[PDB]
Design a protein around this ligand. Structure first.
Ligand SMILES: *[C@@H]1O[C@H](CO[C@H]2O[C@@H](C)[C@@H](O)[C@@H](O)[C@@H]2O)[C@@H](O[C@@H]2O[C@H](CO)[C@@H](O[C@@H]3O[C@H](CO[C@H]4O[C@H](CO)[C@@H](O)[C@H](O)[C@@H]4O[C@@H]4O[C@H](CO)[C@@H](O[C@@H]5O[C@H](CO)[C@H](O)[C@H](O)[C@H]5O)[C@H](O)[C@H]4NC(C)=O)[C@@H](O)[C@H](O[C@H]4O[C@H](CO)[C@@H](O)[C@H](O)[C@@H]4O[C@@H]4O[C@H](CO)[C@@H](O)[C@H](O)[C@H]4NC(C)=O)[C@@H]3O)[C@H](O)[C@H]2NC(C)=O)[C@H](O)[C@H]1NC(C)=O
Ligand SMILES: *[C@@H]1O[C@H](CO[C@H]2O[C@@H](C)[C@@H](O)[C@@H](O)[C@@H]2O)[C@@H](O[C@@H]2O[C@H](CO)[C@@H](O[C@@H]3O[C@H](CO[C@H]4O[C@H](CO)[C@@H](O)[C@H](O)[C@@H]4O[C@@H]4O[C@H](CO)[C@@H](O[C@@H]5O[C@H](CO)[C@H](O)[C@H](O)[C@H]5O)[C@H](O)[C@H]4NC(C)=O)[C@@H](O)[C@H](O[C@H]4O[C@H](CO)[C@@H](O)[C@H](O)[C@@H]4O[C@@H]4O[C@H](CO)[C@@H](O)[C@H](O)[C@H]4NC(C)=O)[C@@H]3O)[C@H](O)[C@H]2NC(C)=O)[C@H](O)[C@H]1NC(C)=O
Ligand SMILES: [Zn+2]
Ligand SMILES: [Zn+2]
Ligand SMILES: [Zn+2]
Ligand SMILES: [Zn+2]
Ligand SMILES: [Zn+2]
Ligand SMILES: [Zn+2]
Ligand SMILES: [Zn+2]
Ligand SMILES: [Zn+2]
Lengths: 210, 210
């Protein structure tokens, strides 16, 4: 019946690059028309804060308003497991709605990042697959990119993180490049972002072995 | 309000091994108590069939019955895209409920299966990762297993299928073995089941390269 609140973490890579600006987004839906006005309270670890930016309310094609409040989080605060509560109040609910969010909890484990060259049997086609193996990481939040002399290789696909038998995650990234490039001798680098890396970043280069 | 019908495909590997017995399962839920009796109709491509086996009805801890009907499908019929309709009738619904199911549609593409040996940089620890790369397959339904001299290696994890830039899927399987075994010279084989393989099966062996 009453409104419903949803609270969304920042983008993983906004949290891992200190130059970016991570945000937590509080969304209330099913805002009626009779009792439309809603109040946001915000708390960082149970202490009230006032720097949130609420958006002007919008009307939905089901006879309902939508109101979003955005709060910037600090890079260190997010990574240090600080907890972000959004309180939503409306003279229509029996009581207020509270939703709390933080970064995935758990002891962090630093990834091991490995590059693997094409298979022997695959050395037949004109396009080949370059493999990044990333293993032993925790939490599951991660980002992977491939690059070659400055520019980005964007012909890649990365698997979702897979929960591994020790409680850590792994994944693979597959870079597809024209084979002549592999033989020419191009440098290809898989670059990984994860909290548990030094400065949340590492790079591994792959090359035609002599 | 009325009952709800759900219709479930067979297990992927039941469909890929001709010795097994795939089944489609029709589940109706929200069966009331006042109007409890339900009738299953079944059709293979719009033609009625009578070999389904309905289970004796069970009562749910929300004041509702659950009734399941199971229909065996033929191996060839399933793989040839035959369509399986379950009709559910009850003197309580404004009208009957029909749900139709078949194998994932689309032109089949045969996987390319590749085994990759541990990374140079990973050759430091006492456990190593063996990689099966399976690529270019369609539909996404697939099964992967590792084995060594007869017995199954069960210390493996396989990624979900990832949709690749050409419309085909890929995935990787990661076999973890003690490093001494890699150096001793053990044969390790990744065995893949997919519709588009000859007899829905192939095998690729991986060994310490000399
Ligand atoms: C009236 O219409 C209302 C909507 O208006 C309309 O517009 C459309 C939605 C359309 O569908 C029309 O219906 C209509 O015209 C409608 O409101 C809707 O209600 C639903 C439920 O009642 C809501 O469903 C929830 O959705 C969540 C995900 O929503 C995201 O994804 C969808 C698309 O996939 C999208 O529509 C949403 O906008 C939202 O997108 C995300 O938005 C945030 C904020 O912008 C982004 O994050 C930010 O991104 C920016 C840059 O964009 C930047 O990166 C910031 O840093 C960052 O913060 C995301 O990027 C963005 N994602 C995407 C993909 O775009 C679901 O998670 C939620 O699931 C929950 O409940 C499920 C069961 O329903 C359950 O399965 C699930 O577990 C989950 O439960 C919670 O969550 C945890 C799991 O994650 C659990 O562990 C917990 O148990 C539980 N939480 C707790 C503690 O309780 C759910 O499905 C729907 O979002 C909402 N629609 C909108 C638009 O808000 C309303 O219902 C209608 N009225 C009536 C009468 O019904
Ligand atoms: C009263 O209580 C009822 C239940 O009794 C109780 O028991 C529990 C369920 C408990 O939760 C208690 O609540 C209660 O005590 C309750 O009924 C429930 O209603 C729900 C919806 O109203 C149903 O939800 C649906 O579930 C589907 C998946 O269900 C499977 O998985 C769950 C566990 O994850 C499990 O509980 C189910 O039993 C079922 O398991 C699968 O079962 C089949 C059959 O056995 C197996 O297949 C067979 O397996 C055998 C060997 O086991 C062999 O291999 C055979 O070959 C093979 O056939 C599976 O192996 C098995 N899986 C698992 C993991 O065990 C969801 O898919 C479904 O989603 C649909 O709707 C969603 C939104 O709700 C939507 O997101 C989604 O897209 C989807 O929509 C359809 O599907 C397509 C996507 O796949 C879409 O493309 C289509 O658009 C759409 N279809 C179309 C064409 O319309 C949904 O969530 C719930 O299952 C049901 N509970 C049970 C137990 O049946 C009832 O609601 C209560 N009453 C009231 C008043 O509410
Ligand atoms: Zn304030
Ligand atoms: Zn807390
Ligand atoms: Zn380090
Ligand atoms: Zn930092
Ligand atoms: Zn009959
Ligand atoms: Zn049809
Ligand atoms: Zn073949
Ligand atoms: Zn066959």
């Amino acid at each position: 019946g009453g409104p419903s609140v949803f609270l969304f973490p920042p983008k993983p890579k906004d949290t891992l690059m200190i130059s970016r600006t991570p945000e937590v987004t509080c969304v209330v839906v099913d805002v009626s028309h009779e009792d439309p006005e809603v109040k946001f309270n915000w708390y960082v670890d149970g202490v009230e804060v006032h720097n949130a930016k609420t958006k002007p309310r919008e009307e939905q094609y089901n006879s309902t308003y939508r109101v979003v409040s955005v709060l910037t989080v600090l890079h260190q605060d997010w990574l240090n497991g600080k907890e972000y509560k959004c309180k939503v109040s409306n003279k229509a609910l029996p009581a207020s709605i509270e939703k709390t969010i933080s970064k995935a909890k758990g002891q962090p484990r630093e990834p091991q990042v490995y590059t693997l060259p094409p298979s022997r049997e695959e050395m037949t086609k004109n396009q080949v697959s370059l493999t990044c193996l990333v293993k032993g990481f925790y939490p599951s939040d991660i980002a992977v990119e491939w690059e070659s002399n400055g520019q980005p290789e964007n012909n890649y696909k990365t698997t979702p993180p897979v929960l591994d038998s020790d409680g850590s995650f792994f994944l693979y990234s597959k870079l597809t490049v024209d084979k002549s490039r592999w033989q020419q001798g191009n440098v290809f680098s898989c670059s990984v972002m994860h909290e548990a890396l030094h400065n949340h970043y590492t790079q591994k280069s792959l090359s035609l072995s002599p």
